């Protein structure tokens, strides 16, 4: 018999992104080649099958630094990290291949789906 | 020129609630009289003006235990904590006064609004 506040989940996510922008309570740095990205482990796990696996691991759960595979593109990661915190995906002709490869690695199935559909439409 | 995934914010919140249920990466215990509630500081701040103030404080940000005012009802807090993590508010005739008082203390304006409207309709 609950009532539901429609905008609540979006409002929560907006405030989590504000915390990220101000570097408040971030507990991990994701290293992608020469670039570093600070984030909240809970948000990363909630969005990515890869981070969910990493941070449920009894040893990796306590690491402050995670190094991604050297084949991962920093811009592709940046676009996906922004997506995690906003629901908005900056998908462009110039970045779609990097975004899709990064989303496959991060196990972000909905992003992979759409990248596949956008590529299929251009061929 | 971004695209947006409609269900993303709800999916994030669902996974944050799963983390809470499994006690994964919870970093604070909220003590309400004889009861204890584990939560994620980032979610509490994102939902409550009171917790946003508490956890941006340079000393309180590092506390693992927060004790609420003894006038706060544990069931009212429990209902609001569930709301924070799900967007669903278990508002009942028997708990509405406790929920509204707790929401005023926690500075959760949308919950206060609706409690006020539900009370006005019954008088």
């Amino acid at each position: 018999s609950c009532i539901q506040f429609t905008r609540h989940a979006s409002d929560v996510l907006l405030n989590l992104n504000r915390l990220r922008s101000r570097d408040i309570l971030t507990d991990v740095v994701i290293v992608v080649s020469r670039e570093q990205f600070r984030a909240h482990k809970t948000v990363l796990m909630a969005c990515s099958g890869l981070f969910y696996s990493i941070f449920t691991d009894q040893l990796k759960c306590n690491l402050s630094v995670i190094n991604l595979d050297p084949e991962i593109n920093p811009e592709g990661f940046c676009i996906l990290l922004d997506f995690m915190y906003t629901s908005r995906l900056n998908l462009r002709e110039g970045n779609i291949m990097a975004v899709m490869a990064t989303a496959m690695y991060l196990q972000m199935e909905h992003v992979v789906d759409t990248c596949r559909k956008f590529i299929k439409a251009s061929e | 020129s971004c695209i947006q995934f409609t269900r993303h914010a709800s999916d994030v919140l669902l996974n944050l609630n799963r983390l809470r249920s499994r006690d994964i990466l919870t970093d604070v215990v909220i003590v309400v009289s004889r009861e204890q509630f584990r939560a994620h500081k980032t979610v509490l701040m994102a939902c409550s003006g009171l917790f946003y103030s508490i956890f941006t404080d340079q000393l309180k940000c590092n506390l693992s235990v927060i004790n609420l005012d003894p006038e706060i009802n544990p069931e009212g807090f429990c209902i609001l904590l569930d709301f924070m993590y799900t967007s669903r508010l278990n508002l009942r005739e028997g708990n509405i006064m406790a929920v509204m008082a707790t929401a005023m203390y926690l500075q959760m304006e949308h919950v206060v609004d609706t409690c006020r409207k539900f009370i006005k309709a019954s008088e």
Binding site: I3, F5 | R88
Partner: peptide, 4 residues
């Protein structure tokens, strides 16, 4: 607020 809605009835979900």
């Amino acid at each position: 607020w809605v009835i979900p």
